[PDB]
Design a protein around this ligand. Structure first.
Ligand SMILES: *C(=N)[C@H](C[C@@H]1CCNC1=O)NC(=O)[C@H](CC(C)C)NC(=O)CNc1c(F)cc(F)cc1F
Ligand SMILES: *C(=N)[C@H](C[C@@H]1CCNC1=O)NC(=O)[C@H](CC(C)C)NC(=O)CNc1c(F)cc(F)cc1F
Lengths: 305, 303
């Protein structure tokens, strides 16, 4: 029993983290096969970062301008290119700790683990969700750029996030490992506002299922609603619409608990309309939206990697 | 900026997890140098989990009765002994992934990472606090026993918890790596229950400093309090007494924010009186107590 915000075991990813220096800017890189991936803004300076010409800055840069440190071993750079907002540094040596991996772009509402790194050193690991407004609510300080987000299936690491910046609201923005931004953000030193956020409805429902699996039942409501009736009330409260697709994905959790999705929707409608009346669910006084249906099945059935 | 319940990176511990089988019972073991550590209840027969005599069950076992599997490979057991509630299996091979390590016993309120394991493989990593009633609020199923809790300082892994049991209220009890239980718990399935739990006050105060460091001051007020008046009020909400030791420990956070510890104490008294009034603090509608002053310094200033 119990339900915790669990990250993936981080050991396959720890073995890929390296330090990258260009000029006096130091951040993290991901060393996979014979390539180091890091944010292109490592080639920027104070003078450039307000409106950089990355094309022209990379043109001017040559291999020897990039110090790549893997612990204490300095890696020989033999090649530099840019893909979208990621710098690819070719190095003389394939990472012998390179895990089975792939680059996967996730959707809003999906979850992943962040390995927060400083000077190529893994500091810590935490689970978060890609917000519907494409921000993540991270914890990131100076020197954290190039820190990555991942999922595991079996022995395969799916890399989904590389950290680039903080928005004025204290939330965070980055790219997939192909250098494509999540959300409407650019890599320069300017205040950029995220779109107003919404709650990931399907995840709140998944977490209510987790609560029922762990004997937390007080909020259950026998008065079924319709998808339409639910979505009218969801919209008012800045919740994402629940789709028939979302209903399907809750299929397994619905079968295992015996609670109809539309019955869990009626419960959620009442919590929205009337609050918790001082009570908690799984130690929270807020409705939690950072657990996917699969995250709940994974934790509750003890899936290993 | 931002603040998250961060675990330590788990790689140094993943390299130590093995599977231990005795009869039809399989759980996790911790392989450090040439010793595997696991819960002694791995030798418990399904017939008698109420009053096992572990010294009697163990004297009846040969080395070859313990099957230790490190992923693909069977390790040969050449020795076995019991320390308190932990079994020590000597194996013929030193673990080549053994990190630098030590065994520490932690105090209530101290935090650690759990690597939840089944059959010697990891399911996930999460951050825990040792509760004042000596339980942890974990996530543990059948087969999780031998999962460990740890802190990492530089390159050195401090092991502080090994998982043994779930209590009837869904909270968890276990030992240090010398096999001494935290709290009054025993490795028998006779009725046991944790004392009523209290809030770790010094941790709630650390978290309020974290909320200020991250640019929120809504919950502050113009008041101060004596330590004694704080304690008389806090104890009415089942908060742990704050001590002078706790006040000295919050000194660094006080100095960073320019808020006196007894001024943050006044803020907490008002939060306990009023609640949140529909607001949140660092993404919570409850006062969080699973972050230490050290946790807040490491996460807010430079890990
Ligand atoms: C990578 N090392 C940093 C990570 C930042 C620093 C503190 N926390 C983080 O997550 N990335 C940056 O500093 C980028 C670099 C540019 C070239 C994209 N810049 C930002 O993070 C932007 N910061 C920022 C503003 F520019 C303006 C604001 F109003 C608020 C901000 F957070
Ligand atoms: C180790 N693999 C398990 C972990 C448990 C199982 C469910 N969640 C967990 O954390 N440990 C056990 O099964 C122990 C073994 C005994 C011999 C210590 N038993 C329990 O955790 C549950 N049994 C039990 C009590 F521990 C206390 C009681 F008062 C009543 C019980 F039934």
């Amino acid at each position: 029993s119990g339900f915790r915000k669990m990250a993936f075991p981080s050991g396959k990813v720890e073995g890929c983290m390296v330090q990258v220096t260009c000029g006096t800017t130091t951040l993290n890189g991901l060393w996979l096969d014979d390539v180091v991936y890091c944010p292109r803004h490592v080639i920027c300076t104070s003078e450039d970062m307000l409106n950089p010409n990355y094309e022209d800055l990379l043109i001017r840069k040559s291999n020897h301008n990039f110090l790549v440190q893997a612990g204490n071993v300095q890696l020989r750079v033999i090649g530099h290119s840019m893909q979208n907002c990621v710098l690819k540094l070719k190095v003389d040596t394939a990472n012998p700790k390179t895990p089975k991996y792939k680059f996967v772009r996730i959707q809003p509402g999906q979850t992943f683990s962040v390995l927060a790194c400083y000077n190529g050193s893994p500091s810590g690991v935490y689970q978060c969700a890609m917000r519907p407004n494409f921000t993540i609510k991270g914890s990131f300080l100076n020197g954290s750029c190039g820190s990555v987000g991942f999922n595991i299936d079996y022995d395969c690491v799916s890399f989904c996030y590389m950290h680039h910046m903080e928005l004025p609201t204290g939330v965070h923005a980055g790219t997939d490992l192909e250098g494509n931004f999540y959300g409407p953000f650019v890599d320069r030193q300017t205040a950029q506002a995220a779109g107003t956020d919404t709650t990931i409805t399907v995840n709140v429902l998944a977490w209510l299922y987790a609560a029922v699996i762990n004997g937390d039942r007080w909020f259950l409501n026998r008065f079924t609603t319709t998808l339409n009736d639910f979505n009218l009330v969801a919209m008012k409260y800045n919740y994402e619409p629940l789709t028939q697709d979302h209903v399907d994905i809750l299929g397994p959790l619905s079968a295992q608990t015996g609670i109809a999705v539309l019955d869990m929707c009626a419960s959620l409608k009442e919590l929205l309309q009337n609050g918790m009346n001082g009570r908690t669910i799984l130690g929270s006084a807020l409705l939690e939206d950072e657990f996917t249906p699969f995250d709940v099945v994974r934790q509750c059935s003890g899936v290993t990697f």
